[PDB]
């Protein structure tokens, strides 16, 4: 029941305007502009009520995207539609920028007319949109394209052909960790997703398998999937079966909290010498095989607010003390497993009030590692196409694990 859909820029101008219901008028755009973009207070909510009228807004790059309704619309549905439309526009023309919107004006208006009709979100998987939306022939291909837009299998187009049946698997994870100094893990959480890039011909029936037995096996608390995968089969017999849409798509999402392998062990050592000098040394142990090279490693060591000088000593890598962040940022380009590194730091403290004790913030660390912290490994992935003659052996499979750190903090 999306009454109207508007897009603004950072200046405040209306890049595009489209209204689907009479109840929404020209006043809604002005009200949103005066109330949300130019709001005096920064404390808001994603959805706001303005004179018996609801506005949903999300921000992509420097571009505002808003949807206005005067009915009791489903909030989650509207937000998911906004995300999906952002994804579709990104799939067409990359970055969602002002000049991109200006240049592709007709294309975005085609999308607005098609993917939504009288406030009811229609098919928007952009697999079918490529077929009949550009930037003759006979009834055959026309009925084919109409059925593939409206039918059950809407994500994949009928006439996909390739000379090299290859697919790409990407296991992306973000870890949230907060370790207590007493050796007890106070909070653990791993969020992951499997991104699949498929270049396959026909309508393959793909089976995805992993170590989800519930000699490597992990206990996943729950799995949240894509649309293309059949959820009824997953519930009935614990099988992941899907037809991969052409191009990139997010196959599944998973959450893990047990049996988490720690990439590193943080041992902080703080020595207090009166009120002038502070000795802090941090040593990290690489708990993985040496064949894996850790990359983009960032260690953030907090410093007292009354620090007058910081000395950096490092044998491997470089240690940077930046006053802009008021912390010591220690970066290492690469090292292998079962390696160690040490830093010597001298903290000179300016005079301050004796009453004010120092509440140490946690030591935040950022890293990217080739291994998956949860331990999820793709055991197999079967592909079968009855219509064509290529077998599973003809298909070439690739897998990559990129585990990026999320909120990785260490109490000191």
């Amino acid at each position: 029941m999306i009454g109207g859909l508007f897009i603004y820029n950072h200046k405040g101008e209306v890049l595009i305007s489209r209204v689907y219901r009479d109840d929404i008028g020209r006043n809604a755009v002005d009200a949103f502009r005066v109330n949300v973009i130019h709001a005096r207070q920064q404390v808001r909510s994603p959805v706001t009520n303005i004179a018996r009228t609801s506005f949903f807004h999300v921000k992509r790059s420097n571009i505002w995207l808003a949807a206005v309704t005067k009915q009791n619309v489903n909030a989650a549905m509207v937000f998911e539609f906004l995300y999906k439309m952002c994804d579709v526009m990104a799939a067409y023309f990359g970055k969602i920028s002002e000049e991109n919107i200006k240049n592709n004006f007709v294309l975005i208006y085609e999308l607005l007319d098609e993917i939504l009709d009288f406030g009811y979100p229609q098919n928007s998987e952009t697999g079918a949109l490529k077929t009949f939306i550009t930037q003759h022939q006979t009834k055959e291909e026309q009925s084919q394209i109409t059925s593939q837009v409206t039918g059950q299998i809407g994500w994949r187009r009928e006439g996909i052909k390739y000379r090299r049946n290859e697919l790409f698997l990407d296991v992306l994870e973000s870890v949230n960790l907060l370790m207590s100094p007493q050796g007890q893990v106070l909070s653990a959480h791993v969020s992951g997703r499997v991104v699949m890039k498929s270049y396959l011909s026909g309508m393959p029936e793909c089976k995805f398998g992993m170590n989800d037995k519930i000699k490597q096996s992990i206990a996943i608390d729950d799995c949240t999937f894509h649309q293309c995968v059949r959820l009824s089969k997953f519930d009935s017999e614990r099988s992941i079966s899907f037809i991969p849409p052409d191009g990139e798509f997010e196959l599944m999402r998973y959450r893990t909290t047990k049996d988490i392998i720690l990439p590193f062990r943080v041992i902080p050592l703080v020595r207090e010498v009166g009120r002038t000098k502070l000795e802090v040394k941090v040593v990290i142990k690489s708990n993985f095989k040496p064949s894996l090279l850790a990359q983009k490693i960032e260690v953030r060591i907090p410093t007292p607010l009354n620090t007058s000088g910081v000395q950096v000593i490092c044998m491997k890598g470089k240690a940077k003390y930046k006053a802009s962040e008021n912390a010591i940022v220690w970066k290492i380009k690469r090292m292998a497993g079962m390696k160690e590194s040490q830093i010597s730091a001298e903290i000179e403290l300016l005079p301050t009030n004796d009453k004010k004790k120092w509440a140490r913030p946690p030591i935040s660390m950022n890293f990217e590692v080739p291994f998956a912290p949860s331990g999820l490994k793709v055991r197999y992935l079967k592909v079968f196409e009855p219509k064509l003659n290529y077998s599973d052996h003809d298909v070439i499979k690739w897998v990559r694990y990129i585990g990026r750190s999320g909120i990785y903090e260490t109490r000191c």
Binding site: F168, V378, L381, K397, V399, R400
Partner: peptide, 5 residues
């Protein structure tokens, strides 16, 4: 990056 599956 890419490893054989």
């Amino acid at each position: 990056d890419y490893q054989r599956l």
